[PDB]
Scaffold this active site. Structure first.
Site, PDB file in Angstrom:
ATOM      1  N   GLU B 869       0.935  -1.487  -0.164  1.00  9.12           N
ATOM      2  CA  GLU B 869       0.128  -0.129   0.133  1.00  9.12           C
ATOM      3  C   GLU B 869       0.657   1.403  -0.148  1.00  9.12           C
ATOM      4  OE1 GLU B 869      -1.822  -1.812   3.392  1.00  9.12           O
ATOM      5  OE2 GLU B 869      -3.673  -1.038   2.038  1.00  9.12           O
TER       6      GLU B 869
HETATM    7  N1  PCD Z   1       9.745  -5.948   1.360  1.00  7.56           N
HETATM    8  C1  PCD Z   1       9.161  -6.276   0.680  1.00  7.56           C
HETATM    9  C2  PCD Z   1       8.079  -6.122   0.697  1.00  7.56           C
HETATM   10  C3  PCD Z   1       7.076  -7.040  -0.204  1.00  7.56           C
HETATM   11  N2  PCD Z   1       7.328  -7.650  -1.054  1.00  7.56           N
HETATM   12  C4  PCD Z   1       6.664  -8.091  -2.028  1.00  7.56           C
HETATM   13  O1  PCD Z   1       5.812  -7.973  -2.221  1.00  7.56           O
HETATM   14  C5  PCD Z   1       4.472  -8.115  -2.048  1.00  7.56           C
HETATM   15  C6  PCD Z   1       3.411  -7.618  -1.417  1.00  7.56           C
HETATM   16  O2  PCD Z   1       3.366  -7.323   0.033  1.00  7.56           O
HETATM   17  P1  PCD Z   1       2.885  -7.153   1.344  1.00  7.56           P
HETATM   18  O3  PCD Z   1       3.258  -5.887   1.066  1.00  7.56           O
HETATM   19  O4  PCD Z   1       3.607  -7.849   2.524  1.00  7.56           O
HETATM   20  O5  PCD Z   1       2.002  -7.566   0.851  1.00  7.56           O
HETATM   21  P2  PCD Z   1       0.820  -8.684   1.219  1.00  7.56           P
HETATM   22  O6  PCD Z   1      -0.185  -8.759   2.456  1.00  7.56           O
HETATM   23  O7  PCD Z   1       1.241  -9.944   0.792  1.00  7.56           O
HETATM   24  O8  PCD Z   1      -0.337  -7.833  -0.125  1.00  7.56           O
HETATM   25  C7  PCD Z   1      -1.267  -7.170   0.321  1.00  7.56           C
HETATM   26  C8  PCD Z   1      -1.649  -5.740  -0.550  1.00  7.56           C
HETATM   27  O9  PCD Z   1      -1.247  -6.616  -2.113  1.00  7.56           O
HETATM   28  C9  PCD Z   1      -1.625  -4.949  -3.167  1.00  7.56           C
HETATM   29  N3  PCD Z   1      -0.564  -5.307  -4.287  1.00  7.56           N
HETATM   30  C10 PCD Z   1      -1.627  -6.054  -5.640  1.00  7.56           C
HETATM   31  N4  PCD Z   1      -0.475  -6.350  -6.486  1.00  7.56           N
HETATM   32  C11 PCD Z   1      -1.062  -6.688  -7.346  1.00  7.56           C
HETATM   33  N5  PCD Z   1      -0.967  -7.342  -8.397  1.00  7.56           N
HETATM   34  N6  PCD Z   1      -2.952  -7.159  -7.469  1.00  7.56           N
HETATM   35  C12 PCD Z   1      -3.477  -6.596  -5.870  1.00  7.56           C
HETATM   36  O10 PCD Z   1      -4.541  -7.196  -5.797  1.00  7.56           O
HETATM   37  C13 PCD Z   1      -2.860  -5.920  -5.412  1.00  7.56           C
HETATM   38  N7  PCD Z   1      -3.543  -5.469  -3.812  1.00  7.56           N
HETATM   39  C14 PCD Z   1      -2.781  -4.193  -2.784  1.00  7.56           C
HETATM   40  C15 PCD Z   1      -3.956  -5.109  -0.955  1.00  7.56           C
HETATM   41  S1  PCD Z   1      -4.767  -4.384  -1.274  1.00  7.56           S
HETATM   42 MO1  PCD Z   1      -6.079  -4.361   1.024  1.00  7.56          MO
HETATM   43  O11 PCD Z   1      -6.643  -6.502   0.528  1.00  7.56           O
HETATM   44  O12 PCD Z   1      -6.961  -2.893   0.808  1.00  7.56           O
HETATM   45  O13 PCD Z   1      -4.981  -3.690   3.081  1.00  7.56           O
HETATM   46  S2  PCD Z   1      -3.211  -4.650   1.429  1.00  7.56           S
HETATM   47  C16 PCD Z   1      -2.340  -5.455  -0.485  1.00  7.56           C
HETATM   48  C17 PCD Z   1       4.905  -9.555  -2.162  1.00  7.56           C
HETATM   49  O14 PCD Z   1       4.795 -10.441  -2.952  1.00  7.56           O
HETATM   50  C18 PCD Z   1       6.155  -9.506  -0.595  1.00  7.56           C
HETATM   51  O15 PCD Z   1       6.364 -11.035  -0.577  1.00  7.56           O
HETATM   52  C19 PCD Z   1       9.470  -7.445  -1.213  1.00  7.56           C
HETATM   53  O16 PCD Z   1       9.690  -8.440  -2.199  1.00  7.56           O
HETATM   54  N8  PCD Z   1       9.808  -6.790  -0.294  1.00  7.56           N
END
Ligand code: PCD
Ligand code: PCD
Ligand SMILES: *C(=O)CCc1ccccc1
Ligand SMILES: *C(=O)CCc1ccccc1
Ligand code: FES
Ligand code: FES
Ligand code: FES
Ligand code: FES
Ligand SMILES: [Cl-]
Ligand SMILES: [Cl-]
Ligand SMILES: [Cl-]
Ligand SMILES: [Cl-]
Ligand SMILES: [Mg+2]
Ligand SMILES: [Mg+2]
Ligand SMILES: [Mg+2]
Ligand SMILES: [Mg+2]
Ligand SMILES: [Mg+2]
Ligand SMILES: [Mg+2]
Ligand SMILES: [Mg+2]
Ligand SMILES: [Mg+2]
Lengths: 907, 907
Positions: B869
């Site tokens: 993320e």
């Molecule tokens: N230092 C480091 C860290 C990490 N990695 C790699 O890279 C991946 C990632 O890891 P992580 O951060 O521990 O994670 P996970 O627990 O396994 O998975 C889950 C995520 O995964 C992402 N990315 C992606 N891509 C793609 N192609 N498709 C998708 O659908 C998706 N979804 C998105 C979401 S939305 Mo939430 O259920 O709202 O809380 S949380 C989330 C994997 O293969 C592992 O082993 C490496 O290489 N190194």
């Protein structure tokens, strides 16, 4: 349901299955692996062979509960693919092992299993393996299959290079007479040729699957049909009866002879008033699947008044028998043969006479692929039928009035098919699927199971025969008398013609100046007659070739020398008063003689008190053509890309329509230097291919081969440049010149045999051969083993030796079955391969020997005759003559079942 | 119907089709070519790309009437197969282009079409081609795909050897930190990994296909359901309603907070009394096919009393609004944040204050694969569900009471899946398919179409936000005030938790000693909230990171330098009063600074009167874990064959659960010398894998990676020999010693944030980054083009660089969509990819730059944090800050649609 994670052809599959489902269905339907072929569905044929955890198993009798998590499966698709062929696949192609090809995936997978356990098998090891794994073939006689395994093993073992499995061009060119592989072989050996059942799995979701509601008695008046319960069942769309048929609801025999007492309109499409044989189709259930259609068909109720059934010719022919077709006598046709002088006085004054009563029965074709067809309404308004028809134009005219279409509104196409051996000279399913397509408007598909293939396709027609010879002390034949009764079941199509074959072929091979005989055709309630490879000759020549040995015995003469004394020579005529076109029988006998003498000596030396060896001889003769001035047509077309398409309706049972077209065209096109891989053939289609005629009567190589030759000669003329050389496609189109050129050929100067005397010139080309059988009889049990078969064959000139060798081996194997094990007499017991005596590999000797003694035919293309039916004309006579040599017992009524032989030994 | 003889992947097919049928259906269903993937079904995504006569076409919008006799078609199966990979396939594997893999076949086929017409394309040629052919990817940000095409082209052109497309082992070994390819890549690039729709086509004939009967109004009381017409329709088995549900018919939120005013049992499985949003499932039609089920679902009649609907948070939150869930206030949860001293007096005496009102909306996940699931009753009596769940154990407990099963009687499995981006943190189809399997006893399969994916899966929840800062003249932050209102639609699951994310992440990145704020969660009748990658941070940090630039502007300070002044350093605490675990923000800013200055100079130089360029910055922070002392478990098992299976429930959205397992285990197993290809991963399954927890909160690498590490350490101990070295499997089994060894790990010393103050230590590992966006605004139209994105990322240590690079590129691309084009506001207009503003390739710059500045984490395995993320935390803030840099316009309410920008430019 259960999840099973396994490997199929090297790839992990995440499968979701019913534990009770068959592996064949999972592979074909769920995974699309239509290279797994299904024939018998009962574990008897091997077509569905797959490798499961190193063992070769029949997928049709393997439930998913027997497939463990982590199992490894290999189908033909995992052995190899086009352009990545396995040595076994290359070897199959080189050795010509794919004729129809339906068994090829299963044999190849089974053979891979063999070689993975025994890298260097003997030929007997290969035979033992295919016996144990039930790998069945009806086309090849097994020897080519064993040859291919041995060659592949040598390559895999490093004893010869893999390049030696690839065809080497003879280098004058000439593919005529060579072992050039057939075009369809690669598809067959890779499981990528779609047969009718395969096509059904690949049709769209709208497609309705049919099941037949069939008679379960042999003869009845029908009072009503109740479909109510069936309509409530899962997946059911509708039920079709005679009320839904838009035409006459009859198939016409089309060429019913004028002297036939019936009108040829006897056979229903869907039974209305009567059941005429067990299995008759009374209704069709349409459903979403074959399984749901079949389940619902069981619930359709037919109200019948059962009638006494006549289950043999003699029973039906009795003076007081009730007419099966009211208004037509059961004995509906008679054909006399009247040659030369009255025979009674000649018999009275002859030095020697002999007589016998003989029987040949209701042989079942037993292709590995059961019957299948489909139909649909085209977007052009026409009804299209795709089936195993081997006479697409013929069948169009036989069914159109019955289904209610004009001929231009129906199109018949031949699918790739897994053998027929003649049963597809008759309509089977074509009218049924047409009626259903027309009634529903939807695509429809109908697959017979193996019991339906046996019970509800036509059969060789039994003949009860009496034949007599009169001769001089020196063995010269003076006269013959003959009587034959042909049990044709209830449907007349081509039964009068079959009966006429007895006038033509009883006694064929010899000069017989004086003949008096009579054939009779009778309707019965046993299975209707459809052509079976040899069509009258296996019956006719069993009688005369056995009787020749009886004459030799009565004279104290050697049976080969008696034949030598009497065989056709210039000046002689055949039974219909016609001069033979070539005279090769003396040559063939002279070349066989030392091998026959050596075989006699071997039999004497190797016999024991219990295992008695013998040697038997017979001659075979048959026409190449349909009677009278038969004809064909072909179109030879230069395509934009420089290839040439040779358009024909040469129907392929599996015998080699593809290679016959390519090889014949190649030879005709040699002046223009056309490579064989540039020549294309066409699948039969009544709308878009010419009326080349049916693949019956061992006729196509002669008739269609000549039409191809003429079309190609005409294309050469169309391409010839002023001053020498040939124009290209581009040059011709620039000049607004034609590129698609017709050729026709007719057997002019053939004439149809007379209705009163039987005399005429029915074929302009015949096939000639001499058989030798070597057998051992266990006199404690009556069991006969055929240890060797030889055929001396005069085919004029070979179009393709892989094709002709294979034709001969396959016919010899069917002869062993006819002699020893096969029949269709018991409606239930003979409705399986094993029950009806199918020849598995151990019953066919590895020693199948051919000697070609070719005398070019005046009217054949490049001198060729046909081959297809020659090897089944009389091999069974040679075998029975060999049992007589061995033991002193003559079997007069086929087959020579062990108990029958034992009773005769002990009498 | 029509016969069409064509070539598919080099092999002649004899096809029987409806001329109106879609090529995608023919290929997938009739021919089994499930490598042709189908997503949108509307020609917008390219997943179904095939080559037809040299042109790349979308099979889902190509009818069979457009396929000529003799046509040539290529699908992924014809490009290459495992162990016969095409250079494009090898290049995809090497460059990590298959994340979920769902687009991979279509991109590879499309790329083959490109290279067959332009052998040596520029990168821009590649981008133009994928734009024109509509090849869409939601996972990769496109750059890896272009990299793969260029490398393949070089090989095909002979400029480098094909062996250079194969991974080269670093040769100390260590796959940890390398570009080792992921195990699933080969299957993905060959179309041989079966996703849920693929599995449906490969299920047995008994399987019922479902269609949903859905609400077509946003809010109603239900009076009745009439299924009578539907039951008479083709292929229909039954219709399922709430009456067929065997349990409570409610999904439980399971961890509903005590201070929530609702009980967490608000969401129905099948609506009984009420419709709560457009799309709610009221009934399920069961039929023989998806098509027949859908047709019949249209005929089910629902009798409704429509009620006024509240379609935004402010509307539903009004004091007098009617309760959507009678008995629970629409505003059902509040989370205060109370850190340090009262903020009012601090704002009053501060040198500088700023305030803003911001909005982030209902972003749609838009995976290329629409939702799909299936269920069946096992032979063991349990109900099995296979779906896109990314929390199989979590979902089991959320649905079991509702469907009426004890937990041991249900099994959930994760199918291979084509992306989720969080929507699968919620149940979607699992309870529906379970109910239907239980009611019918039959296997059932349910596929959503793309409109159902958009309308009837959960969404990012809109936040209406007010945030304020007080600061000294030198830029030092003194205090923050915050207010946020979370529109969670009608279903409460995890909505209180999402609201708590605002207390944790508004203002994250800086030392802010004094905070007073309040988040509120409100039920509405717009789409219910499901996690979307970033889960509260994209909302929170859009507000605070935009407000930081507003503060910089008011101070006359550079916005990067303002961040440098305030970024976390030792002694500081985050908004919940917790000390950061590493301090990498100053390092990252110092390393970015010269690139930011160069980008400013470039923007000034390259701007024109109409096309104004700008540069924007933001910081992102997010936890790796679920709140409090999160934990995981793994089993490390020595198998008989010497391989090692690492058993986990690490759910793979496509991010790389496979490679995360293999790489982490490889590093832990180094003392025993285990090759990476000998290490196996397990697909998630509640019966047979441990409770590793869901793939949410960027947690698996930390939690499950630590559990894998511990399990592997424990396996090493189990294998250690006295005197040195390791026992083999055989040696251990001979000694009756264990071979399957458990490991567990817990984030001990995390604590859940307090319900009254918001203070706590919710995660022990965080992810830290600094974004830079470079944009051009056409001031005549308001259109913004993103010309470059940079992320400085501290991930601690990389398990796999192909995985992490790809994660970052994919998140940056989703950030561009969130900033400029994406929403789900208009139920119909936003129900397509194009309608909802999906980013096609030209909208994502080729210049996506990563700089890793890794500070090993004390508690992460080998020092790793998560990544998933991080790249979506605030890229959209950097982009809006860049629009402001370029033009002087600030967009406060996303997205920055052209008309919205233009109105602001002209005001
Ligand atoms: N230092 C480091 C860290 C990490 N990695 C790699 O890279 C991946 C990632 O890891 P992580 O951060 O521990 O994670 P996970 O627990 O396994 O998975 C889950 C995520 O995964 C992402 N990315 C992606 N891509 C793609 N192609 N498709 C998708 O659908 C998706 N979804 C998105 C979401 S939305 Mo939430 O259920 O709202 O809380 S949380 C989330 C994997 O293969 C592992 O082993 C490496 O290489 N190194
Ligand atoms: N000389 C010569 C001859 C021949 N050939 C070849 O051989 C074949 C054959 O030919 P023919 O003889 O002409 O014949 P066709 O017409 O084509 O065909 C038919 C036949 O064929 C046979 N064979 C067979 N094989 C197989 N495999 N399969 C089958 O099924 C079968 N069938 C059978 C039958 S019976 Mo009837 O319809 O009854 O009349 S007649 C018949 C062909 O391929 C050809 O080309 C050659 O090569 N050469
Ligand atoms: C053979 O004697 C007669 C054959 C025949 C002539 C006319 C029409 C049908 C068949
Ligand atoms: C966060 O204030 C409370 C989280 C929670 C405690 C007990 C059970 C459910 C959720
Ligand atoms: S043995 Fe399986 S189909 Fe004959
Ligand atoms: S080739 Fe063996 S059954 Fe036809
Ligand atoms: S373009 Fe065909 S499925 Fe999306
Ligand atoms: S890898 Fe492209 S959509 Fe997932
Ligand atoms: Cl007898
Ligand atoms: Cl017996
Ligand atoms: Cl705004
Ligand atoms: Cl706009
Ligand atoms: Mg090889
Ligand atoms: Mg004479
Ligand atoms: Mg009997
Ligand atoms: Mg007896
Ligand atoms: Mg290659
Ligand atoms: Mg300080
Ligand atoms: Mg709007
Ligand atoms: Mg406006």
């Amino acid at each position: 349901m259960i999840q099973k994670v396994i490997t199929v052809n090297g790839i992990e599959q995440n499968l979701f299955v019913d534990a009770e489902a068959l592996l064949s269905d999972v592979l074909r339907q769920q995974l699309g692996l239509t290279g797994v072929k299904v024939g018998c569905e009962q574990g008897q044929c091997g077509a569905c062979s797959v490798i499961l955890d190193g063992k070769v198993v029949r997928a049709c009798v393997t439930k998913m509960k027997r497939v463990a998590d982590g199992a490894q499966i290999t189908t033909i698709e995992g052995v190899g693919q086009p352009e990545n062929l396995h040595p076994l696949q290359k070897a199959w192609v080189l050795h010509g092992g794919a004729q129809c090809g339906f068994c090829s995936p299963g044999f190849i997978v089974s053979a891979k299993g063999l070689l993975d356990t025994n890298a260097d098998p003997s030929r007997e090891d290969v035979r033992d393996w295919f016996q144990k794994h039930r790998n069945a073939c009806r086309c090849t006689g097994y020897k080519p299959l064993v040859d291919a395994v041995m060659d592949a093993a040598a390559v895999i073992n490093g004893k010869k290079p893999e390049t030696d499995l690839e065809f080497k061009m003879p280098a004058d060119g000439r593919i005529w007479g060579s072992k050039y592989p057939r075009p369809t072989a690669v598809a067959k050996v890779t499981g990528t040729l779609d047969y009718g059942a395969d096509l059904g799995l690949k049709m769209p979701a709208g497609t309705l699957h049919l099941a037949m509601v069939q008679a379960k008695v042999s003869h009845a008046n029908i009072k009503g049909i109740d479909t109510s319960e069936a309509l409530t069942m899962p997946g059911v769309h509708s039920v079709i009866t005679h009320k839904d048929v838009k035409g006459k609801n009859r198939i016409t025999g089309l060429i019913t002879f004028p002297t036939n007492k019936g009108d040829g309109w006897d056979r229903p499409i869907l039974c209305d008033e009567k059941v005429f044989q067990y299995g008759d189709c009374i209704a069709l259930v349409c459903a979403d699947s074959e399984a749901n259609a079949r389940a619902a068909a069981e619930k359709v109720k037919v109200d019948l008044e059962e009638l006494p059934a006549y289950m043999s010719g003699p029973a039906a022919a009795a003076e007081d028998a009730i007419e099966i077709h009211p208004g037509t006598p059961n004995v509906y046709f008679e054909q006399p043969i009247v040659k030369g002088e009255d025979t009674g006085p000649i018999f009275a004054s002859a030095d020697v006479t002999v007589e016998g009563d003989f029987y040949v029965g209701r042989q079942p074709h037993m292709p590995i692929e059961p019957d299948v067809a489909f139909a649909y309404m085209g977007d052009d308004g026409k009804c299209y039928i795709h089936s195993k028809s081997i006479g697409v134009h013929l069948h169009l005219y036989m069914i159109a009035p019955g289904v209610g279409l004009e001929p231009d509104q129906l199109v018949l196409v031949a699918n790739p098919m897994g053998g027929t051996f003649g049963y597809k000279f008759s309509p089977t399913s074509e009218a049924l699927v047409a009626v259903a397509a027309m009634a529903t408007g939807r695509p429809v598909h109908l697959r017979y199971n193996y019991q339906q293939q046996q019970q509800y396709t036509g059969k060789r027609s039994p003949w009860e025969m009496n034949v007599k010879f009169a001769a001089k002390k020196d063995g010269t034949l003076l006269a013959m008398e003959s009587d034959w009764l042909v049990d044709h079941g209830p449907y007349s199509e081509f039964g009068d013609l079959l009966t006429l074959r007895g006038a033509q072929f009883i006694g064929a091979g010899y000069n017989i100046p004086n003949i008096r005989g009579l054939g009779r055709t009778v309707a019965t309630n046993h299975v209707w007659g459809s052509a079976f490879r040899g069509y009258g000759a296996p019956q006719s020549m069993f009688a005369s070739e056995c009787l020749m040995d009886m004459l030799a015995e009565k004279l104290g003469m050697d049976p080969l020398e008696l034949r030598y004394k009497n065989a056709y020579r210039p000046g002689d005529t055949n039974p219909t008063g016609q001069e033979p076109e070539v005279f090769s029988l003396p040559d063939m006998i002279d070349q066989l003689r030392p091998k026959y003498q050596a075989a006699l000596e071997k039999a004497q030396k190797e016999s024991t008190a219990t295992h008695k060896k013998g040697v038997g001889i017979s001659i075979g003769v048959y026409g190449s053509g349909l009677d009278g001035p038969d004809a064909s047509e072909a179109w030879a077309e230069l395509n934009a890309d420089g290839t040439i398409t040779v358009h024909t309706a040469w129907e392929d049972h599996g015998q080699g329509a593809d290679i016959g077209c390519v090889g014949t065209a190649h030879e005709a096109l040699r002046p223009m230097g056309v490579a064989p891989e540039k020549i294309k053939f066409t699948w039969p289609n009544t709308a878009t291919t010419p009326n080349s005629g049916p693949s019956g009567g061992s006729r196509q190589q002669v008739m269609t081969g000549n039409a191809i030759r003429v079309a190609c000669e005409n294309l050469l003329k169309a391409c010839e440049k002023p001053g020498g050389g040939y124009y290209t496609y581009d040059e011709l189109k620039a000049a607004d010149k034609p590129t698609k050129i017709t050729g026709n050929w007719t057997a002019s100067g053939a004439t149809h045999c007379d209705a009163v005397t039987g005399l005429g010139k029915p074929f302009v080309v015949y096939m000639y051969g001499v058989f030798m059988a070597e057998v051992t009889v266990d006199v404690a049990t009556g069991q006969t083993t055929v240890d060797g078969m030889t055929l001396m064959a005069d085919l004029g000139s070979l179009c393709n030796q892989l094709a002709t060798d294979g034709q001969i081996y396959g016919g010899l194997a069917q002869g062993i079955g006819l002699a020893l094990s096969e029949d269709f007499e018991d409606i239930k017991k003979h409705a399986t391969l094993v029950g009806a005596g199918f020849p598995f590999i151990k019953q066919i000797p590895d020693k199948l020997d051919i000697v070609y003694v070719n005398h070019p035919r005046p009217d054949g293309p490049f001198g060729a005759s046909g081959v297809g039916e020659l090897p089944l004309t009389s091999p069974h006579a040679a075998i029975i003559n060999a049992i007589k040599s061995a033991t002193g017992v003559r079997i007069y009524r086929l087959p020579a079942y062990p108990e029958k032989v034992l009773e005769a030994l002990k009498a």
